[PDB]
Amino acid sequence: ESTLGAAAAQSGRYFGTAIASGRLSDSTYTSIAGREFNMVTAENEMKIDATEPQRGQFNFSSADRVYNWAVQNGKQVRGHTLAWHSQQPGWMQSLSGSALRQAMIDHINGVMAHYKGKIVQWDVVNEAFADGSSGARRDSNLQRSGNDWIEVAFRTARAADPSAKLCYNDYNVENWTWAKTQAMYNMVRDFKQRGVPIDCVGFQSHFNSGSPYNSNFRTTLQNFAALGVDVAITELDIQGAPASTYANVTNDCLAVSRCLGITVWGVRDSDSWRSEQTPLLFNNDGSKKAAYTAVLDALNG
Ligand SMILES: O[C@@H]1[C@@H](O)[C@H](O[C@@H]2CNC[C@H](O)[C@H]2O)OC[C@H]1O
């Protein structure tokens, strides 16, 4: 096949991107993204601050611009993200303990209701682990409310929209030997022991010199799949966009039956949150990079 999404679809997978509403008046962006991808994640517009800027008062305008663009252009949507320490609106930053717990639940319920039956995967919880050797939970108001915050988010989400696959998403969890990876593994293990309704694990896959790709990513994906969850590569970008690594990652997903697909975290290098690292598949001018060709070729076998 001649495009990433269609090539992924040959094996029942998707190839997605992050879409930013502020870029939707750029004709190069909309036409290349339209052509190439069959899955969309809103880069910002479905986060907590964007969707509930005051408690109880939702704003789906920008989120719906992204969602509607996606469906108009024949893409499914990953919802990103319902419960997270980052990008919280001030009113939520001020809450702790039981008040925060209620607000967390209410936020999940309100956003998921708006999209009920329309979102194939939700990143229900994002970035709950600390970096480094400890495997500890990250410090946040959410984590201070109790170790159960994550499981409660998942139980809430399952009741709100039984149709959605519920994902836990994180970064620096791709290398099987890292403590962070093992922390996430053991959480998912525990969740399965206790009936917590997690369906998927999202590997952000922000690869760079400090957190480099390792061939053992395939082992990580296999081992999580074996816990009884799907796996997804959710925010792929690679410092310098080497073709070799991009092919390796693609082939890792293709080798794991429950790997749903790959989302790259933007369209052109100039659209990247890390544009200085030129880490995506398209040049600033919209032309295809060597890494594009390597990914397409891998998807095509
Ligand atoms: O626009 C950026 C956006 O790309 C960034 O996205 C996060 C990258 N780190 C992992 C998270 O899960 C993503 O949402 O968020 C900050 C924005 O300024």
mmCIF file of N, CA and C in Angstrom, residues 122 124-125 129 150-151 153-155 157-158 164-169 184-202 224 227-231 258:
data_model
loop_
_atom_site.group_PDB
_atom_site.id
_atom_site.type_symbol
_atom_site.label_atom_id
_atom_site.label_comp_id
_atom_site.label_asym_id
_atom_site.label_seq_id
_atom_site.Cartn_x
_atom_site.Cartn_y
_atom_site.Cartn_z
ATOM 1 N N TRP A 122 -9.060 4.995 25.207
ATOM 2 C CA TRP A 122 -8.775 6.146 26.050
ATOM 3 C C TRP A 122 -7.484 5.909 26.832
ATOM 4 N N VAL A 124 -6.660 6.543 29.957
ATOM 5 C CA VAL A 124 -7.402 6.898 31.163
ATOM 6 C C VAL A 124 -6.497 7.571 32.196
ATOM 7 N N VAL A 125 -5.315 6.970 32.371
ATOM 8 C CA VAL A 125 -4.307 7.479 33.287
ATOM 9 C C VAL A 125 -2.986 7.594 32.509
ATOM 10 N N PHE A 129 4.189 6.817 36.976
ATOM 11 C CA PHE A 129 5.432 6.349 37.592
ATOM 12 C C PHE A 129 6.513 7.415 37.562
ATOM 13 N N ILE A 150 -5.394 5.227 40.564
ATOM 14 C CA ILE A 150 -5.336 4.705 39.205
ATOM 15 C C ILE A 150 -6.452 3.693 38.966
ATOM 16 N N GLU A 151 -6.576 2.712 39.868
ATOM 17 C CA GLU A 151 -7.629 1.728 39.745
ATOM 18 C C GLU A 151 -9.008 2.377 39.769
ATOM 19 N N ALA A 153 -9.775 5.361 38.728
ATOM 20 C CA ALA A 153 -9.967 5.993 37.414
ATOM 21 C C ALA A 153 -10.431 4.954 36.397
ATOM 22 N N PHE A 154 -9.778 3.791 36.365
ATOM 23 C CA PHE A 154 -10.151 2.736 35.448
ATOM 24 C C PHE A 154 -11.559 2.201 35.712
ATOM 25 N N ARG A 155 -11.914 1.948 36.967
ATOM 26 C CA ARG A 155 -13.272 1.471 37.246
ATOM 27 C C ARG A 155 -14.312 2.498 36.802
ATOM 28 N N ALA A 157 -13.986 4.723 34.395
ATOM 29 C CA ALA A 157 -14.022 4.735 32.926
ATOM 30 C C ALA A 157 -14.787 3.543 32.375
ATOM 31 N N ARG A 158 -14.594 2.357 32.934
ATOM 32 C CA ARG A 158 -15.289 1.173 32.451
ATOM 33 C C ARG A 158 -16.809 1.366 32.547
ATOM 34 N N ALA A 164 -15.196 1.423 25.164
ATOM 35 C CA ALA A 164 -13.844 1.945 24.967
ATOM 36 C C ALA A 164 -12.815 0.959 25.509
ATOM 37 N N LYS A 165 -11.701 0.806 24.809
ATOM 38 C CA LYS A 165 -10.533 0.145 25.387
ATOM 39 C C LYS A 165 -9.857 1.126 26.307
ATOM 40 N N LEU A 166 -9.606 0.683 27.539
ATOM 41 C CA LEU A 166 -9.035 1.556 28.580
ATOM 42 C C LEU A 166 -7.531 1.321 28.701
ATOM 43 N N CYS A 167 -6.744 2.363 28.417
ATOM 44 C CA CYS A 167 -5.289 2.265 28.404
ATOM 45 C C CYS A 167 -4.663 3.029 29.560
ATOM 46 N N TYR A 168 -3.564 2.448 30.047
ATOM 47 C CA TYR A 168 -2.575 3.161 30.870
ATOM 48 C C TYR A 168 -1.405 3.578 29.993
ATOM 49 N N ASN A 169 -0.993 4.836 30.033
ATOM 50 C CA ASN A 169 0.011 5.349 29.088
ATOM 51 C C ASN A 169 1.192 5.902 29.878
ATOM 52 N N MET A 184 5.570 -0.570 35.984
ATOM 53 C CA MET A 184 4.336 -0.607 35.208
ATOM 54 C C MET A 184 3.865 -2.052 35.008
ATOM 55 N N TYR A 185 4.786 -2.984 34.750
ATOM 56 C CA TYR A 185 4.469 -4.376 34.558
ATOM 57 C C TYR A 185 3.803 -4.940 35.798
ATOM 58 N N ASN A 186 4.412 -4.699 36.943
ATOM 59 C CA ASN A 186 3.836 -5.217 38.143
ATOM 60 C C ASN A 186 2.487 -4.595 38.515
ATOM 61 N N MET A 187 2.281 -3.314 38.192
ATOM 62 C CA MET A 187 0.956 -2.712 38.379
ATOM 63 C C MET A 187 -0.086 -3.410 37.512
ATOM 64 N N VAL A 188 0.225 -3.593 36.234
ATOM 65 C CA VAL A 188 -0.748 -4.174 35.364
ATOM 66 C C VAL A 188 -1.050 -5.614 35.806
ATOM 67 N N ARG A 189 0.001 -6.334 36.203
ATOM 68 C CA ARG A 189 -0.141 -7.673 36.765
ATOM 69 C C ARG A 189 -1.149 -7.639 37.921
ATOM 70 N N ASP A 190 -0.883 -6.762 38.876
ATOM 71 C CA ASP A 190 -1.724 -6.638 40.071
ATOM 72 C C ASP A 190 -3.177 -6.312 39.667
ATOM 73 N N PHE A 191 -3.339 -5.376 38.741
ATOM 74 C CA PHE A 191 -4.667 -4.962 38.282
ATOM 75 C C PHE A 191 -5.439 -6.161 37.731
ATOM 76 N N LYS A 192 -4.727 -7.030 37.018
ATOM 77 C CA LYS A 192 -5.348 -8.201 36.472
ATOM 78 C C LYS A 192 -5.708 -9.188 37.583
ATOM 79 N N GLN A 193 -4.864 -9.315 38.601
ATOM 80 C CA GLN A 193 -5.181 -10.189 39.714
ATOM 81 C C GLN A 193 -6.493 -9.715 40.367
ATOM 82 N N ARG A 194 -6.739 -8.405 40.372
ATOM 83 C CA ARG A 194 -7.811 -7.829 41.210
ATOM 84 C C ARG A 194 -9.022 -7.368 40.405
ATOM 85 N N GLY A 195 -9.066 -7.698 39.120
ATOM 86 C CA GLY A 195 -10.220 -7.336 38.320
ATOM 87 C C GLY A 195 -10.341 -5.886 37.954
ATOM 88 N N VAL A 196 -9.263 -5.126 38.052
ATOM 89 C CA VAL A 196 -9.299 -3.739 37.650
ATOM 90 C C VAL A 196 -9.397 -3.749 36.137
ATOM 91 N N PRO A 197 -10.293 -2.957 35.532
ATOM 92 C CA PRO A 197 -10.526 -3.046 34.080
ATOM 93 C C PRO A 197 -9.590 -2.198 33.189
ATOM 94 N N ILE A 198 -8.335 -2.620 33.140
ATOM 95 C CA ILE A 198 -7.382 -2.138 32.155
ATOM 96 C C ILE A 198 -7.316 -3.109 30.938
ATOM 97 N N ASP A 199 -7.466 -2.574 29.708
ATOM 98 C CA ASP A 199 -7.494 -3.321 28.459
ATOM 99 C C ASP A 199 -6.239 -3.168 27.602
ATOM 100 N N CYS A 200 -5.428 -2.154 27.883
ATOM 101 C CA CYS A 200 -4.347 -1.771 26.993
ATOM 102 C C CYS A 200 -3.303 -1.000 27.763
ATOM 103 N N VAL A 201 -2.070 -1.130 27.268
ATOM 104 C CA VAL A 201 -0.957 -0.324 27.745
ATOM 105 C C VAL A 201 -0.368 0.449 26.571
ATOM 106 N N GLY A 202 -0.209 1.740 26.792
ATOM 107 C CA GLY A 202 0.363 2.650 25.815
ATOM 108 C C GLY A 202 1.813 2.949 26.170
ATOM 109 N N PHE A 224 3.916 -7.673 28.202
ATOM 110 C CA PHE A 224 2.680 -7.006 28.585
ATOM 111 C C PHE A 224 1.471 -7.685 27.918
ATOM 112 N N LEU A 227 0.058 -10.486 29.775
ATOM 113 C CA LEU A 227 -0.775 -10.239 30.949
ATOM 114 C C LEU A 227 -2.258 -10.180 30.604
ATOM 115 N N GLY A 228 -2.592 -10.191 29.325
ATOM 116 C CA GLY A 228 -3.962 -10.051 28.921
ATOM 117 C C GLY A 228 -4.412 -8.651 28.550
ATOM 118 N N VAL A 229 -3.486 -7.842 28.034
ATOM 119 C CA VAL A 229 -3.814 -6.509 27.553
ATOM 120 C C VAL A 229 -3.308 -6.327 26.124
ATOM 121 N N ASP A 230 -3.976 -5.478 25.366
ATOM 122 C CA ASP A 230 -3.392 -4.977 24.120
ATOM 123 C C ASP A 230 -2.242 -4.022 24.440
ATOM 124 N N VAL A 231 -1.384 -3.810 23.437
ATOM 125 C CA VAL A 231 -0.329 -2.824 23.555
ATOM 126 C C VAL A 231 -0.394 -1.883 22.369
ATOM 127 N N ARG A 258 -0.985 -8.624 19.655
ATOM 128 C CA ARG A 258 -1.844 -7.650 20.323
ATOM 129 C C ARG A 258 -1.342 -6.214 20.255
#
